[PDB]
């Protein structure tokens, strides 16, 4: 009985693969050969921020292009003024096992999550003069892996139980749930339009959701290993994924297929973060080789190297205006590059 | 030349001082990871130690040391992903139920041989030793381990299963403190304390430059 619909699904995959292959009239790798490369790129650590004392995990740039958020195994969620190294807040967490963080676009909220399965939202503009827990969202059955703000009232999250959800903060309930992954989802990233987002899971599949209908609208399967980080191309038409196979891959949302792959023969370690620059010409990624490497997104050449950490990097992010890029490692330091 | 943000600068310095003073106080505790199969004596050992849908952090103090005793078994997801978070724990409080083995052994092999835990020692509490006597009297262990030979006796059975656990270690650089649970307490705490003292001495003597 089930075998009939199983064969129907198999035929569906065969025909969708045929259609996907039919769209490959050319490739970006051969079209791009007409344009010149960006040349060799180098950068220096303009600041070394060393407030933390144990194993920074995740970070996020504020909208003001000035304020940083970072979280560590030490249990201190502290936010930094990048221009002048000053601390401005130290938020003591109820549990030290953090794995992700997010800074709201308006700057009024910072969100934290970890193995405790609960997402806690901290308010910054309280009249009392100190931060306080606005809400503690609950309902998941697996470790949180990424949090992002659509606005001050709606937060989206990705968890270790193979589901993603969108929360109405003012009511503390999962207003819409996204499902269909086989493995658990490791990271999440939402488009500038805020209408649609992607997430990657340990089953090597990365797929596109929309935040209003809740349907899974596209699925990509290029990798061979667990997905570990995703970030959109700045114009919202494409995104790149990092995987634990030393190769970063770029997918196009309208072609619905892989366009190019970034790899080099001497690297075998796993990816930990991915993020484009403001123009989209440059793709920055983190590695377990204790360093950071930057690729020309349209040439797939290792145009530069950003080494300088004593331990593997675990987070990365460029500013919303492209002025600088920040990265953090288990050595408990954040570097600022230009 | 600084503006009147000197107050912000001094506030940042105060935050740094407070963070350092909190970290130095927090560093005094010893961190343990408690692990095992479901029902495999975790509840028994924590209860006899006489002292939220995911991780749970038991906490108790003994001999001027505060033991943070984390139980990660509550979570149900890909172990290979979240396991790296518990790096730098001083020891693993592993425990198995003797009355129940062929998958607990695989889990122990995975944990002891993991990339991250290459250097950390392991305490291995054999549990349910009391009713294991009834188990061995009522049924032979050969149905569990066909390769076994020799007498069906309590002490040799315990020694053989302990050797089976011990043999799966790949590197001689780590110790494995096996001990019986005896469901009576007031002694296993001394065992874990001795293991922690050995680990502290080893770490201090390695860092100070004798290794």
């Amino acid at each position, epitope marked *: 009985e089930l075998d009939q619909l199983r064969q129907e699904a198999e035929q569906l995959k065969n025909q969708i693969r045929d259609a996907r292959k039919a769209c490959a009239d050319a490739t970006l790798s051969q079209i791009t050969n007409n344009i010149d490369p960006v040349g060799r790129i180098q950068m220096r650590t303009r600041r070394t921020l060393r407030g933390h004392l144990a194993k920074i995990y995740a970070m996020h740039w504020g909208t003001d292009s000035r304020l940083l958020v970072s979280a560590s195994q030490d249990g201190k969620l502290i936010i930094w003024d990048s221009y002048t190294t000053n601390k401005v807040h130290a938020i003591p967490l109820r549990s030290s096992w953090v794995m992700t963080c997010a800074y709201a676009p308006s700057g009024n909220y910072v969100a934290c999550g970890g193995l405790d399965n609960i997402c806690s939202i901290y308010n910054l503009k309280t009249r009392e003069g100190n931060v306080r827990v606005s809400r503690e969202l609950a309902g998941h059955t697996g470790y949180l892996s990424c949090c992002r703000f659509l606005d001050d009232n709606q937060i989206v999250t990705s968890s270790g139980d193979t589901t993603c959800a969108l929360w109405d903060i003012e009511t503390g309930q999962q207003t819409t749930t996204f499902t269909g992954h086989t493995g658990d989802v490791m990271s999440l990233s939402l488009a500038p339009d805020t209408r649609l987002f992607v997430s990657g899971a340990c089953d090597a599949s990365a797929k596109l959701w929309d935040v209003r209908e809740g349907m899974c609208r596209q699925t990509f399967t290029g990798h061979e290993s667990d997905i570990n980080a995703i970030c959109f191309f700045p114009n919202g038409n494409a995104f790149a994924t990092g995987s634990d196979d030393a190769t970063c891959r770029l997918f196009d949302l309208r072609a619905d297929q892989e366009l190019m792959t970034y790899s080099h023969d001497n690297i075998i370690c796993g990816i930990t973060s991915v993020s484009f620059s403001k123009s989209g010409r440059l793709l920055l990624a983190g590695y377990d080789d204790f360093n950071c490497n930057v690729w020309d997104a349209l040439k797939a050449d290792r145009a530069g190297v950003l080494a300088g950490h004593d331990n593997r990097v675990s987070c990365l992010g460029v500013t919303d205006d492209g002025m600088a890029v920040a990265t953090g490692s288990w050595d408990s330091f954040l570097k600022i590059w230009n | 030349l600084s503006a009147e943000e000197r*107050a912000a600068l001094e506030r940042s310095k105060a935050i740094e001082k407070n963070l350092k003073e909190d970290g130095i106080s927090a560093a005094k505790d010893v961190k343990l990871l408690l692990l095992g199969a479901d029902n495999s004596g975790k509840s028994t050992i924590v209860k006899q130690m006489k002292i939220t849908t995911g991780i749970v952090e038991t906490h108790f103090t003994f001999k001027n040391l505060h033991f943070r005793l984390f139980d990660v078994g509550g979570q149900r997801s890909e172990r290979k992903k979240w396991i790296h978070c518990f790096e730098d724990v001083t020891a693993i409080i592993f425990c198995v139920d003797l009355s129940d083995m062929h998958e607990s052994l695989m889990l122990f092999d995975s944990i002891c041989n993991n990339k991250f835990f290459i250097d950390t020692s392991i305490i291995l509490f054999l549990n349910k030793k009391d009713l294991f006597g009834e188990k061995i009297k009522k049924s032979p262990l050969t149905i569990c381990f066909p390769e076994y030979t020799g007498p069906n006796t309590y002490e040799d059975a315990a020694a053989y299963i302990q050797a089976q656990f011990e043999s799966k270690n790949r590197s001689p650089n780590k110790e494995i403190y096996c001990h019986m649970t005896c469901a009576t307490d007031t002694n296993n705490a001394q065992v874990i304390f001795d293991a922690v003292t050995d680990i502290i001495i080893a770490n201090n003597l390695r860092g100070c430059g004798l290794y």
Partner: single-chain antibody, 232 residues
Framework: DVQLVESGGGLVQPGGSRKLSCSAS????????MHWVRQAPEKGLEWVAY????????YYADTVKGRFTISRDDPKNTLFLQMTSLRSEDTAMYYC??????????????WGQGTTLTVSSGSDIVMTQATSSVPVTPGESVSISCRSS???????????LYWFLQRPGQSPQLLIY???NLASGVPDRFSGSGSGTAFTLTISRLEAEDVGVYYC???????FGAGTKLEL
């Protein structure tokens, strides 16, 4: 809610001494700095003393230094000012005011009720204001201006102007800080503007709730304008 209250007023013999204290509740006092400012019955505001969080720093006005001293007791959430050698110039109400300093924060956001004190007979950048008062009617728009002897703009890109409102029979309230940002809870119809040494506060769709006196303030370095009145 947040409450700042003070006590110790009344009358003083000339040349005597009096302890004045401030009481705070509803907020983490230890994380905030505190200023003490005073208002003569026939003059504008004048600054007196300041201490940062944790009592790490302290400042006094040159005309009040030595005669007065201030300190705070964080566990009791109380602030103390000790007065000695009181003279006729010292008669005024004294306001206990809140402050906090970090990027994006707004100082001087809340003011206490104040205590009256009277006595019987026995680098200083100056701010200027164009007029003592102007007439206005509800529904119209009017502009207020103040000027500084030195440029209040700083090399970091900010300018440290502040505008305060004091309604009759009430304590002051913060309207505009950093010369362009509106304080929390202030109606959106207030707005400041200016550059260099010439600064202007503007109001449109004026309402009877805006009738009062406006005090121009600077905060660049270690003063208040004479104040201007709005009459319906």
């Amino acid at each position: 809610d947040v409450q700042l209250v003070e006590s110790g007023g009344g009358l003083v013999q000339p040349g005597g001494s009096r302890k004045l204290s401030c009481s705070a509740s509803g907020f983490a006092f230890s994380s905030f700095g505190m200023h003490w400012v005073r208002q003569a019955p026939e003059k504008g505001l004048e600054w007196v003393a300041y201490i940062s969080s944790g009592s790490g720093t302290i400042y006094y006005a040159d005309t009040v230094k030595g005669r007065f001293t201030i300190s705070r007791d964080d566990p009791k959430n109380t602030l103390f000012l000790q007065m000695t050698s009181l003279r006729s110039e010292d008669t005024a109400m004294y306001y206990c005011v809140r402050s906090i300093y970090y990027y994006g924060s707004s100082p001087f956001d809340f003011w206490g009720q104040g205590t009256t004190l009277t006595v019987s007979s026995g680098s200083d950048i100056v701010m200027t204001q164009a007029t003592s008062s102007v007439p206005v009617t509800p529904g119209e728009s009017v502009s207020i201006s103040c000027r500084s002897s030195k440029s209040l703009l700083h090399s970091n890109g900010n300018t440290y102007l502040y505008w305060f409102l004091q309604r009759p029979g009430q304590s002051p309230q913060l309207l505009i800080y950093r010369m362009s940002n509106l304080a929390s809870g202030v109606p959106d119809r207030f707005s400041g503007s200016g550059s260099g040494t010439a600064f202007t506060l503007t109001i449109s769709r004026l309402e009877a709730e805006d009738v009062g006196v406006y005090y121009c303030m600077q905060h660049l370095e270690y003063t208040f304008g004479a104040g201007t009145k709005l009459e319906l």
